[PDB]
From a paper:
The ETC consists of four multisubunit membrane complexes: complex I (CI; NADH:ubiquinone (UQ) oxidoreductase), complex II (CII; succinate:UQ oxidoreductase), complex III (CIII; cytochrome bc1) and complex IV (CIV; cytochrome c oxidase). We purified the intact respiratory supercomplex from mitochondria of the ciliate protist [name] and determined its structure by single-particle cryo-electron microscopy (cryo-EM). Here we show that a supercomplex containing all four respiratory chain components contributes to membrane curvature induction in ciliates.
Owing to subunit acquisition and extension, complex I associates with a complex IV dimer, generating a wedge-shaped gap that serves as a binding site for complex II. The second major interaction site at the CI–CIV interface, which is on the lumenal side of the membrane, also involves a fragmented protein subunit, this time from CI. Consistent with the observation with respect to the protein splitting in CIV, we modelled the N-terminal extension of the ND5 fragment (ND5a), as well as the newly identified protein subunit [name] (from CI). [name] engages in interactions with at least four subunits of CIV, as well as an interfacial CIV haem group.
Numbering used by the authors:
A (entry chain AM): 1 to 231
B (entry chain AQ): 127 to 188
C (entry chain BI): 24 to 172
D (entry chain A2): 160 to 212
E (entry chain BM): 8 to 68
F (entry chain AK): 28 to 257
G (entry chain AG): 1 to 297
H (entry chain AU): 2 to 150
The structure:
């Protein structure tokens, strides 16, 4: 029975936690008896990937995840998704799903609200070739494929961006609003600007591809310098 | 009073309870009946809930 | 909300135009000038500005049925000590008016000398008309052992 | 400032007390004109001490 | 041995906080020559400080 | 040379020679977050990841059951033109959105600050007020209690109703259980030291100190209320 | 004899036998518990230091800086001159383009510098100030420039010396900010001309931050033993009394601290002469006793 | 059979085996064992020392090490010399307490309070009218801690 | 109960007067216990509030006995009567 | 600044040893040392009860001192003297010996009140250069001393 | 306030998606953005 | 000596001036030894004089009760509250002692 | 039949409206599954203590009052 399986999982998890507690306490007591100060040292407890019980982040090994970033709870990354330095995907209350070839800029924060009205997902879903600038904030928003969001942009709950939409930097998308496909929107309250051209679309595609390549180079260099754990 | 119609029988009711205004968060309207005698969420019998996304990603990673 | 005269699209008012100035003669004979706001007690303003000479053993008194309510509830216990006394100048003392019986009880029970203009900062509520009010703050007594801590 | 608690240093010098506290004229005089008194200035404190006596 | 999957089983940081009188002559085992030298110096100093007290106590005992 | 090492030397809590931060019970400070200087945190207050709180230039007071958000920078000013104390004061149930910056200000209880806000020194936000995400509160500006403001510079929109105030308070109370869920993932004993390699300095100290007192004196009886405790 | 010998024997036996045994057992138990808890748990890690990251031959040159926050990110071609400060969480991705930071240039917390072009460089002058949560893309910022909190400088911007950008200001792309001018708003526009008092306070604020960077660097750059000593000192001060504090000050001044030394107290408290006044103290314009200025009273 | 031999090193464990929970006997109640010397002086009590008293002293010495270390664990701001001196003082105190217990045991054996190896010719046997513990002790571990005629 | 057993109606009356007055004397503080917010009364050690597990455990044992003293009071009464019976009064 | 935890633990240890002596105690019920002390079951039980309660309170005090140290070693030395000498009162067989024992215990309590901590290192930085008068110390000493005098003479 | 989940799985909520339609062309520089969910 | 209701104000002052730990130890010593021996004076030690003690105890109890009934509601200090709790319990135990010696 | 990750699938052929609707439906279904799993874990956390400690509590109460 599923309930029995869950109960067994909880029991074994608690036993493991108690075993860890006693082991660490014994090590500390041994240090105290041995006049060893190793235990006392204060070192950052930050964990890049933190799993809530039953909510473990999942990502393809091809993805580049900045060691400065932090993935928490139910997070799902695509094939070559790149997460910038210092960006946090809390995804603890609900899940966060990302596409194959998206780029998340540095200092981007993604966190979803507790609940929303009927028919509105309470999880962040991002397209395949999305490019999100540094300093952006996202909450329970849906973004389709081939979407570029400018730096320092705020996207609130229930907001849907269709394929090809572009949002200028330093603009906010009010909660529960639609950004149609192939249009440019700017301003703190987003206002229609114009329809995108093929040249601009190609430039955005090239920009996101360049960001993916830069992420690959960063991953290689960090692995070389031992700053990246070989998962 | 004439306009008042919390349910959607006479005046259509959005699934999204309200229309959010700019400079405000999107919050559900307070229901007319606020009874808290609610069960935990109910699901169909033999409901499939396996973490298919995680399983597929783990299988691909190998 | 309320108690403001803003319309859609107006700019916020400056805090400088809203701060109420209180002039004080310190326990050491010097002069001080501090800022307070309407709706908060003179004791809160003085503690925020860190004015010396006030012990405030009870720290404002009870949190319900407080002396700051304009209609003072008869079931109020009043101040729980007399360690926040301040001497207020007559022009504003007369405007403040007669004392509550509990406040007068505490003031007379004060161990140090008292003046007819003495009042309790916790019992005083800041008002707009108190602008530029002059007070004096001699040293208040220490009640219990915990005051030294 | 190291070893002086909440006292903090300004551009032109370091204060003699915590940020929001009030400056003391007597302490200022003691620091600036230590041991020197041209005349026995009668401040409010001196007048009040005389009255109390 | 030296290292396991993640934990260093030989991890060790020496405690730099040690008492000043560690390795002093007096702290040596009682009855040793170093201890006797230290104790003799301490006793001479104490007697010089308190000639009368040492008399009244030790001689009386 | 100066900055060449493999292991970060970053600590969440730090002091400057007299300025020890104080944190209440059930208050979660993320390991990424930095809280340095004279900073006081109340009970059930949560500071999320990558947030900086410097009370070095002046004191910082944080109330109870408040949320600070992510990528938020709270810092103080040397002084204010009005002569008021330049410390940062935040009341209870205050929610501060991510990407926001707080200068020396006075935020009262139940105030909600949007994501990316910029509150400048001397601002006074009264009880229950709300601020749009990308708005700026200019220095020395008073936001009345229970009012909505938006834009840069911020401009009045409308009054807030008791339902809106209750919703904000409910959100502030709701953040607590998420904070506790995050908290439960850390054991009281840090195991990072077990992953380092012994060095010459570790094996043989250059200089020795006199045993005065161990900072963890009585910790065999102290409760491990906060796992992220040195 | 017997009692102390037993004490020493037990001390050695404990330290040499029980310590290692308990340590080994605890480590094995910790490993077993972690294995049991997997995959629904995470363990502590050695967080990498992302200061001075080298990418494809691009080596940061930041050794000539006063303060670099331990948790900041400096990658690629980032050159900083003497006295520059980079604070907590700042990210300088120099691989996109060269990032030059001048002498005594302050970059506050959570400030990101990223060139939007492929190889366009970011040049920042001396005595420049960039506030927290700022975002500079690619621009020429001359000396003594000021950027406020939460301010964005876009690509191609050129702001001249003594140009002020108000906090919360989004400078439009390809914008020129003349000297001694204040620009504010979003999009940022000219507001007024900097007054001498405003310039003075801006300079004082910049100097204050420069000086504070030294204290921050001193605190952050400490060894494990020094941090442990600081924790011990704070704990001891939590219980030190007035007499203990007075004794600390007395020993720092050089007073006798032993009974046999009490007989030479006068040589350390009274005999030592006082330093004569500086001759600048004889040139003061006025010598009237100080009193609070009763203007506004 | 219920008490250890008084001449053994474990003969000092008979102090914890008592017939009734009283402290002292009544003035006139016969001691459980024959009296060897009612008017015992210090010298004769010392002369009556035994392997049981030596075992009590050895127990005190063995148990004073953990107790001395437990006391010392609350020591701070102490030099090594003072710490060792404090350990010596506490250990000596525990051993002195053991000597006192041995002296008391010797005194009890002289007075017949505890098993001294002798038995009265005619036992004075009670009637166990009130019995709340016989079955409990027989079925429990406490039968060892009580002596029954 | 013992006063009634000894037939002291006046003593019972005065005991009750004192008991009720003291009861209100203790109870009135529950009014002050109400606070606008949650207080911070814990000492800070290592930048965090210091909560003592040992004192909490002792308080918990005291709380258990305070709640359920009636159940086990017979044993305590037996022990106290046993102690007092040695006194020949 | 030595923490008095070791003094408190020493007091607990010696109280436990005294409890062991009482548990193993034997003898006849009578008076000793010139009929100035009574040795009977009720008096011994009172002694044991006082010792047990003192031990428990000392245990709680040790935990509190580990929490925070605002009490000197002389404070707990006075507590040690009180704990050592106060249970001997119930062994009194005459009002004369009772008076002397209570006088000794009163001196010990006066010692405890004398060694009370006076000045604290608090967060109030406003009274550095002003005189604040607190009479609690003198009031305690005065009232304790005169109450002891009246009780003793009567 | 209420914390239950709106999106139930026991059955599909009856809805009409044609009463309200979202504008997707012909915008102005002063008009607000349309709404994403328009089911009644 | 004890500080019972007729003479209580000095006890209030002592409690005001004492630390919490001092009160913690002093209440234990007081109740467990001083007051217990005071009770045993009438119960066990000086039992033959109970023909005189009863009236004195009754008068003291009545005077103390009628004197504190109003004072216990005039205090405004935590130390005063603790001291008056001790005083009220002392009076109650004195009434119980009268009942016992009856 | 077989699991399909709609979010990671190719939706370029469909119109943007159909693409967003499919993504929303897929997100809702996955969120419902996650909700079910977490609710089951909460239920297990409820059941375990009951089974483990109900009889000890009854034993304690029975011994106390009988
Ligand atoms: C009559 C008038 C009164 C005076 C009489 C004489 C009394 C002498 C007492 C001992 C004096 C020791 C020296 C004191 C020096 C002071 C000055 C000084 O040094 O200043 C610097 C000194 C610091 O320098 P320091 O180096 O750290 O310490 C000094 C020494 O180095 C280290 O100091 P320490 O104290 O740590 O070390 C002491 C050690 C000094 O070190 C040594 O010399 C090495 C160790 C020698 C050990 C010798 C042990 C001998 C034991 C014999 C037992 C025989 C039993 C036989 C039984 C029968 C067998 C068949 O010497 C001892 O151990 C002395 C023990 C002697 C026991 C004799 C027992 C006689 C029993 C008689 C009756 C017998 C009846 C039965 C007979 C049956 C016959 C059949 O200042 C201090 O702080 C010292 C404080 C000393 C306090 C002493 C008092 C403690 C108790 C206070 C009680 C208060 C009242 C409450 C109790 C009420 C009753 C009293
Ligand atoms: C109906 C009204 C009822 C009113 C009741 C009023 C009182 C209720 C509350 C207090 C009751 C006593 C609680 C236990 C003592 C407190 C300390 C303690 O044990 O916790 C620390 C310790 C905590 O350990 P940890 O947290 O791992 O480490 C702590 C430190 O880190 C490291 O720890 P450390 O190394 O610093 O210290 C270790 C040591 C620390 O513990 C101690 O040192 C003990 C401190 C208390 C000493 C006085 C105990 C007196 C007991 C006799 C009855 C009177 C109780 C009066 C209590 C209040 C006095 C003011 O631990 C122990 O060894 C515990 C042993 C406790 C049993 C001692 C029994 C002595 C009996 C002596 C007389 C025998 C009869 C003589 C007859 C003679 C006839 C001629 O406790 C435990 O390990 C177990 C805790 C959980 C189970 C507790 C069970 C308590 C049972 C109480 C039964 C009471 C009598 C039966 C009911 C009577 C009414 C029907
Ligand atoms: C409340 C306060 C506390 C409780 C109340 C206080 C009680 C006060 C009254 C106590 C009276 C005790 C009297 C005991 C007298 C008998 C002693 C005894 O057993 O002697 C047996 C022995 C004699 O044993 P005997 O009696 O068998 O010998 C006679 C034997 N016949 C008859 C057969 C010949 O006594 C002695 O030989 C020595 C006598 C005393 C010598 C002088 C000692 C002075 C000690 C001064 C202090 C030293 C401190 C050293 C410290 C060292 C470390 C720092
Ligand atoms: C048939 C053959 C039978 C042969 C039997 C032979 C053995 C006879 C002796 C058995 C002794 C059993 C253990 C006794 C108690 C040991 C206590 C101990 O070591 O704890 C150290 C401990 C020291 O602590 P610790 O060593 O547990 O560790 C402390 C660790 N920290 C501090 C971190 C928590 O002592 C205490 O803590 C006690 C403090 C209060 C003082 C209590 C004094 C009690 C005195 C008891 C005397 C012995 C009574 C024996 C009764 C026998 C009745 C039959
Ligand atoms: S604070 Fe005590 S009366 Fe005002």
């Amino acid at each position: 029975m599923k309930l029995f399986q869950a109960m067994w999982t909880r029991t074994i998890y608690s036993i493991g936690r108690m075993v860890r507690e006693t082991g660490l306490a014994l090590d500390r007591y041994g240090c105290k008896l041995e006049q060893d100060i190793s235990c006392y040292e204060p070192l950052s407890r930050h964990r890049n990937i933190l799993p809530i019980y039953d909510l473990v982040p999942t990502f393809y090994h091809s993805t580049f995840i900045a060691p400065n970033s932090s993935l928490i709870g139910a997070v799902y990354l695509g094939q070559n998704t790149v997460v910038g330095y210092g960006s946090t995907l809390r995804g603890d209350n609900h899940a966060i799903r990302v596409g194959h070839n998206t780029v998340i800029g540095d200092k981007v924060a993604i966190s979803n609200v507790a609940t929303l009205a009927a028919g509105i997902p309470v999880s962040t879903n991002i397209g395949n070739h999305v490019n999100i600038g540094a300093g952006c904030v996202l909450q329970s928003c849906v973004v389709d494929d081939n979407v570029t969001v400018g730096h320092n942009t705020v996207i609130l709950e229930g907001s849907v961006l269709e394929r090809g939409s572009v949002i200028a930097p330093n603009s906010l998308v009010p909660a529960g609003r639609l950004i149609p496909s192939g249009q440019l929107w700017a301003g703190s309250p987003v206002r229609y600007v114009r329809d995108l051209k093929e040249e601009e679309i190609k430039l955005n595609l090239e920009q996101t591809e360049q960001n993916l390549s830069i992420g690959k180079t960063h991953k290689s260099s960090l692995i070389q310098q031992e700053a990246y754990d070989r998962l | 009073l004439l306009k008042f119609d919390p349910f959607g029988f006479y005046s259509p009711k959005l699934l999204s309870e309200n229309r959010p205004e700019e400079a405000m968060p999107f919050y559900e309207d307070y229901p007319q009946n606020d009874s808290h005698w609610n069960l935990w969420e109910q699901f169909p019998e033999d409901f499939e809930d396996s973490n298919a996304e995680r399983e597929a990603i783990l299988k691909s990673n190998k | 909300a309320g108690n403001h005269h803003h319309h859609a699209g107006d700019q916020a008012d400056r805090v400088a135009d809203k701060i109420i100035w209180i002039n004080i003669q310190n326990r050491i004979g010097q002069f001080e000038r501090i800022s307070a706001f309407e709706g908060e007690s003179l004791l809160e303003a003085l503690q925020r500005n860190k004015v010396a000479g006030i012990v405030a053993t009870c720290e404002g008194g009870e949190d319900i049925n407080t002396m700051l309510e304009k209609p003072i509830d008869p079931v109020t216990y009043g101040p729980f000590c007399s360690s926040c006394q301040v001497v207020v100048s007559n022009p504003w003392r007369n405007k403040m008016g007669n004392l509550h019986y509990l406040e007068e009880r505490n003031l007379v029970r004060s161990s140090y000398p008292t003046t007819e203009n003495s009042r309790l900062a916790c019992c005083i509520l800041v008002e707009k008309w108190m602008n530029e009010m002059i007070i004096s703050i001699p040293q208040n007594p220490n009640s219990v052992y915990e005051d030294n801590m | 400032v190291k070893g002086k608690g909440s006292i903090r240093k300004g551009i032109h010098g370091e204060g003699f007390g915590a940020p929001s506290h009030a400056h003391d004229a007597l302490i200022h005089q003691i620091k600036q004109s230590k041991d020197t008194m041209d005349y026995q200035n009668i401040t409010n404190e001196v007048a009040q001490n005389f009255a109390n006596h | 041995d030296f290292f396991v999957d993640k934990y260093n089983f030989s991890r060790r940081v020496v405690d730099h906080r040690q008492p000043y009188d560690l390795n002093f002559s007096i702290n040596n085992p009682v009855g040793s020559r170093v201890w006797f030298k230290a104790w003799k110096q301490k006793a001479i100093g104490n007697f010089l400080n308190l000639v009368g007290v040492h008399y009244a106590f030790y001689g009386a005992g | 040379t100066k900055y060449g090492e493999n292991i970060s030397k970053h600590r969440s809590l730090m002091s400057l020679y007299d300025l020890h931060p104080q944190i209440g019970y059930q208050s979660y400070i993320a390991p990424n977050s930095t809280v340095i200087g004279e900073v006081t945190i109340g009970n059930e207050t949560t500071v999320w990841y990558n947030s900086v709180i410097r009370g070095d230039v002046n004191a910082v007071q944080i109330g109870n059951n408040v949320s600070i958000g992510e990528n938020v920078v709270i810092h103080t000013a040397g002084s204010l033109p009005t002569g008021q104390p330049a410390s940062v004061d935040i009341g209870h149930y205050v929610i501060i959105g991510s990407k926001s910056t707080i200068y020396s200000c006075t935020i009262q209880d139940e105030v909600v600050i949007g994501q990316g806000c910029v509150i400048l020194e001397g601002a006074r936000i009264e009880k229950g007020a709300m601020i749009a995400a990308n708005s700026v509160v200019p220095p020395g500006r008073l936001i009345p209690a229970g009012t909505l403001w938006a834009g840069n510079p911020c401009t009045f929109v409308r009054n807030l109703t008791k339902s809106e105030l209750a919703t904000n308070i409910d959100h502030a109370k709701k953040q607590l259980h998420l904070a506790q869920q995050h908290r439960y993932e850390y054991l009281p004993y840090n195991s990072a030291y077990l992953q380092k390699s012994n060095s010459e300095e570790d094996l043989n100290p250059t200089k020795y100190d006199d045993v005065t007192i161990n900072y963890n004196f009585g910790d065999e009886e102290r409760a491990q209320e906060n796992p992220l405790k040195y | 004899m017997l009692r102390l010998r037993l004490f020493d024997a037990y001390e050695k036996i404990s330290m040499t036998f029980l310590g290692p045994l308990y340590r080994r057992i605890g480590k094995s138990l910790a490993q077993t518990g972690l294995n049991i808890q997997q995959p629904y748990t995470s363990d502590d890690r050695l967080v990498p230091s992302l200061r001075n990251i080298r990418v494809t031959n691009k080596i940061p040159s930041i050794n000539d800086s006063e303060f670099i926050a331990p948790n900041s990110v400096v990658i690629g071609d980032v050159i900083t001159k003497e006295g520059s400060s980079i604070w907590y969480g700042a990210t300088l991705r120099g691989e996109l383009g060269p990032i030059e930071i001048g002498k005594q240039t302050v970059i506050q917390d959570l400030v990101n510098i990223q060139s939007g072009k492929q190889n366009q460089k970011t040049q920042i002058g001396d005595n420049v100030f960039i506030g927290p949560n700022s975002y500079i893309q690619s621009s020429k910022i001359n000396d003594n420039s000021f950027v406020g909190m939460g301010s964005t400088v876009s690509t191609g911007c050129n702001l001249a010396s003594n140009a002020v950008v108000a906090a919360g200001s989004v400078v439009p792309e390809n914008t020129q900010v003349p000297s001694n001018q204040i620009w504010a708003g979003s999009p940022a526009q000219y507001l007024r001309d900097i007054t001498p008092e405003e310039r003075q306070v801006l300079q004082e604020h910049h100097q204050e931050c420069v000086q504070l960077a030294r204290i921050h660097a001193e605190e952050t750059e400490k060894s494990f033993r020094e941090v442990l000593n600081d924790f011990d000192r704070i704990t001891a001060e939590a219980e030190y009394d007035h007499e203990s504090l007075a004794l600390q000050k007395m020993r720092d001044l050089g007073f006798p601290m032993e009974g046999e030394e009490e007989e030479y107290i006068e040589q350390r408290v009274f005999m030592r002469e006082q330093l004569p006044p500086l001759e600048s103290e004889f040139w003061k314009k006025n010598y009237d006793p100080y009193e609070q200025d009763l203007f506004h009273f | 059979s219920q008490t250890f031999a008084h001449d053994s090193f474990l003969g000092g464990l008979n102090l914890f085996k008592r017939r009734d929970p009283r402290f002292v006997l009544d003035q006139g109640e016969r001691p459980p064992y024959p009296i060897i010397n009612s008017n015992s002086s210090f010298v004769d009590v010392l002369s009556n020392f035994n392997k049981a008293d030596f075992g009590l002293v050895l127990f005190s010495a063995a148990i004073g090490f953990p107790l001395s270390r437990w006391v010392l664990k609350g020591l701070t701001f102490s030099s090594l010399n003072y710490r060792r001196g404090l350990f010596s003082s506490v250990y000596g105190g525990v051993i002195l307490w053991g000597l006192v217990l041995g002296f008391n045991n010797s005194y009890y054996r002289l007075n017949g309070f505890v098993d001294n190896g002798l038995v009265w010719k005619r036992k004075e046997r009670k009637l166990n009218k009130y019995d709340f513990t016989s079955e409990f002790e027989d079925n429990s571990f406490f039968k060892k801690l009580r002596i029954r005629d | 109960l013992y006063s009634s057993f000894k037939s002291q109606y006046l003593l019972i009356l005065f005991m009750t007067i004192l008991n009720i007055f003291g009861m209100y004397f203790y109870i009135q503080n529950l009014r002050f216990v109400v606070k606008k917010n949650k207080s911070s009364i814990l000492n800070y050690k290592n930048y965090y509030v210091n909560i003592n597990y040992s004192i909490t455990l002792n308080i918990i044992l005291l709380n258990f006995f305070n709640f359920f003293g009636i159940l086990f009071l017979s044993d305590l009464i037996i022990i106290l009567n046993y102690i007092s019976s040695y006194i020949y009064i | 600044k030595q923490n008095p935890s070791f003094i408190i633990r020493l007091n607990l240890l010696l109280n436990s040893l005294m409890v062991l002596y009482l548990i193993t105690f034997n003898g006849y019920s009578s008076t000793f040392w010139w009929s100035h002390f009574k040795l009977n079951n009720y008096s011994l039980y009172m002694y044991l009860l006082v010792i047990i309660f003192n031990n428990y309170f000392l245990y709680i005090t040790e935990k509190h001192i580990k929490i925070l140290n605002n009490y000197s070693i002389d404070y707990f030395f006075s507590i040690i003297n009180i704990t050592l000498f106060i249970p001997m009162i119930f062994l009194s067989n005459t009002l004369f010996t009772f008076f002397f024992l209570i006088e000794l215990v009163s001196c010990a309590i006066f010692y405890k009140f004398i060694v009370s901590k006076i000045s604290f290192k608090n967060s109030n930085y406003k009274d550095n250069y002003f005189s604040i008068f607190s009479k609690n110390y003198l009031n305690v000493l005065f009232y304790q001393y005169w109450s002891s005098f009246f009780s003793s003479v009567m | 306030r209420q914390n239950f989940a709106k999106n139930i799985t026991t059955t599909d909520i009856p809805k009409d998606s044609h009463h309200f339609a979202a504008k997707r062309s012909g915008f102005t520089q002063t008009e607000q953005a349309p709404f994403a969910y328009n089911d009644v | 000596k004890l500080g019972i209701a007729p003479i209580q104000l000095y006890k209030i002052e002592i409690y005001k001036g004492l630390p919490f730990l001092s009160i913690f130890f002093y209440t234990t010593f007081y109740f467990l030894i001083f007051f217990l021996f005071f009770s045993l004076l009438f119960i066990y030690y000086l039992s033959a004089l109970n023909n005189f003690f009863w009236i004195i105890l009754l008068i003291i109890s009545i005077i103390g009760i009628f004197y504190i009934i109003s004072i216990i509601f005039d205090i405004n200090l935590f130390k005063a509250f603790l001291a008056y709790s001790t005083i009220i319990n002392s009076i109650s135990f004195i009434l119980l002692i009268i009942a016992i010696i009856f | 039949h077989q699991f399909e990750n709609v979010l990671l699938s190719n939706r370029k052929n469909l119109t943007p409206q159909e693409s967003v609707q499919k993504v929303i439906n897929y997100a809702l279904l996955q969120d419902a599954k996650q909700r079910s799993r977490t609710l089951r874990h909460i239920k297990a956390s409820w059941v375990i203590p009951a089974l483990l400690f109900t009889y000890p509590a009854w034993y304690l109460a029975k011994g106390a009052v009988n």
